[PDB]
Amino acid sequence: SLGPLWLDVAGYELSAEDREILQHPTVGGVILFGRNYHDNQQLLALNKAIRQAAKRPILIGVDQEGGRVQRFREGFSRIPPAQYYARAENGVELAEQGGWLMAAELIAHDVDLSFAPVLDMGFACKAIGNRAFGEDVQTVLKHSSAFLRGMKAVGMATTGKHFPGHGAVIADSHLETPYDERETIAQDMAIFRAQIEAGVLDAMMPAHVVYPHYDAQPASGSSYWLKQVLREELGFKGIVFSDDLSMEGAAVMGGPVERSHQALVAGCDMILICNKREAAVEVLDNLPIMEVPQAEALLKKQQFSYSELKRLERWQQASANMQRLIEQFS
């Protein structure tokens, strides 16, 4: 946890190469993907090996939102798209069950966190779509707050995304980066403001999106968005993640070291390099050695097995209810 860099590994088992890189002090976390997941026991063994190799505490994360974004499916409870909760008569009750269930099952497999929830507003952006909890401020706040309560209940740190709002993003040929040209994104940012003020977000992941009325840089590499707005105007005190620095579609920001430097200078606490071991190594070989002690707040607060979890009536009911919810609106 102590170093700023999150990286990833090639497959189902840790390689000798992986074990060495995990000991580099600049490393703070491992992000897992579908390619790292075969089955429950293999996942437990992988995470055990990551923790053994690291020696010191290290973060293990995954994108596990439900619906279209659920990396670990086989042998896990299926979690619905975030959109479904508000379509039910007891959406707030069910959203809390979804957040609790998703989180509990990750903790049972030795994962610290999921990069969730989505706080984006509306379904019109193809990349977001039914990953959003609703189409208006109240609906998003109501159901995302519930989902957050569920995650917190089992001791999982929360991550709001994609700040300052990905709900209305366009990614055609007008600009070289996905963009939102609205003169005001007040409604979208109001959601983030409300959740920051309620004190329920441990971390934030910014959008790799340009908001040209506001600033030239994608929010994820923007000193305006990540310092002036997120810290000074909104008062956020948690961890700021970068976007995946292995990609920058405009291709104007230089190599991985330059991109990493800009994310840190812009206001990111931790940086992510996915799918590109050679880029991660270049960053490791060149970045100053730094520590992110405040990131220890992201380590999970509970430990239990999947067997133990299943003895809870809470699990029995949540898992059954999530299946019924999926069947209801699919």
Side-chain angles (χ1 to χ4, degrees), residues 38 57 61-63 142 261:
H38 193 273
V62 64
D63 301 300
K142 192 170 290 191
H261 177 67

mmCIF file of all heavy atoms in Angstrom, residues 38 57 61-63 142 261:
data_model
loop_
_atom_site.group_PDB
_atom_site.id
_atom_site.type_symbol
_atom_site.label_atom_id
_atom_site.label_comp_id
_atom_site.label_asym_id
_atom_site.label_seq_id
_atom_site.Cartn_x
_atom_site.Cartn_y
_atom_site.Cartn_z
ATOM 1 N N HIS A 38 -9.749 -17.624 -13.019
ATOM 2 C CA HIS A 38 -10.273 -18.893 -13.504
ATOM 3 C C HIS A 38 -11.352 -19.445 -12.575
ATOM 4 O O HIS A 38 -12.442 -19.780 -13.027
ATOM 5 C CB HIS A 38 -9.148 -19.907 -13.659
ATOM 6 C CG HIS A 38 -9.537 -21.121 -14.446
ATOM 7 N ND1 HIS A 38 -10.128 -22.222 -13.864
ATOM 8 C CD2 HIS A 38 -9.405 -21.413 -15.760
ATOM 9 C CE1 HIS A 38 -10.360 -23.135 -14.791
ATOM 10 N NE2 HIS A 38 -9.928 -22.670 -15.950
ATOM 11 N N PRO A 57 2.134 -4.885 3.640
ATOM 12 C CA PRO A 57 0.774 -4.727 3.131
ATOM 13 C C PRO A 57 0.750 -4.159 1.718
ATOM 14 O O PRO A 57 1.505 -3.235 1.381
ATOM 15 C CB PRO A 57 0.141 -3.756 4.130
ATOM 16 C CG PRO A 57 0.873 -4.048 5.398
ATOM 17 C CD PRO A 57 2.305 -4.227 4.954
ATOM 18 N N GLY A 61 -7.033 -4.826 -5.976
ATOM 19 C CA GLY A 61 -8.261 -4.233 -6.445
ATOM 20 C C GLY A 61 -8.734 -4.867 -7.723
ATOM 21 O O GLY A 61 -7.977 -5.565 -8.403
ATOM 22 N N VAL A 62 -10.004 -4.592 -8.039
ATOM 23 C CA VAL A 62 -10.666 -5.105 -9.220
ATOM 24 C C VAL A 62 -11.851 -4.186 -9.568
ATOM 25 O O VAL A 62 -12.407 -3.532 -8.686
ATOM 26 C CB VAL A 62 -11.189 -6.543 -8.968
ATOM 27 C CG1 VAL A 62 -12.266 -6.565 -7.863
ATOM 28 C CG2 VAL A 62 -11.727 -7.164 -10.245
ATOM 29 N N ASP A 63 -12.226 -4.136 -10.843
ATOM 30 C CA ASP A 63 -13.467 -3.469 -11.276
ATOM 31 C C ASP A 63 -14.640 -4.433 -11.145
ATOM 32 O O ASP A 63 -14.849 -5.286 -11.999
ATOM 33 C CB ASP A 63 -13.342 -3.013 -12.729
ATOM 34 C CG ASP A 63 -12.204 -2.058 -12.925
ATOM 35 O OD1 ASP A 63 -12.237 -0.990 -12.277
ATOM 36 O OD2 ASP A 63 -11.226 -2.297 -13.676
ATOM 37 N N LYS A 142 -29.687 8.599 -4.039
ATOM 38 C CA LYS A 142 -30.468 7.649 -3.238
ATOM 39 C C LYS A 142 -29.893 6.226 -3.302
ATOM 40 O O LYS A 142 -29.647 5.583 -2.275
ATOM 41 C CB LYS A 142 -31.911 7.639 -3.761
ATOM 42 C CG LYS A 142 -32.901 6.955 -2.901
ATOM 43 C CD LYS A 142 -34.336 7.217 -3.381
ATOM 44 C CE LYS A 142 -34.763 8.666 -3.151
ATOM 45 N NZ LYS A 142 -36.264 8.901 -3.366
ATOM 46 N N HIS A 261 4.476 11.441 -14.140
ATOM 47 C CA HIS A 261 4.866 12.702 -13.488
ATOM 48 C C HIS A 261 3.706 13.694 -13.519
ATOM 49 O O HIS A 261 3.381 14.302 -12.509
ATOM 50 C CB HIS A 261 6.107 13.291 -14.163
ATOM 51 C CG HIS A 261 6.540 14.616 -13.607
ATOM 52 N ND1 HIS A 261 7.029 14.760 -12.323
ATOM 53 C CD2 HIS A 261 6.584 15.847 -14.166
ATOM 54 C CE1 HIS A 261 7.347 16.026 -12.113
ATOM 55 N NE2 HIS A 261 7.080 16.709 -13.214
#
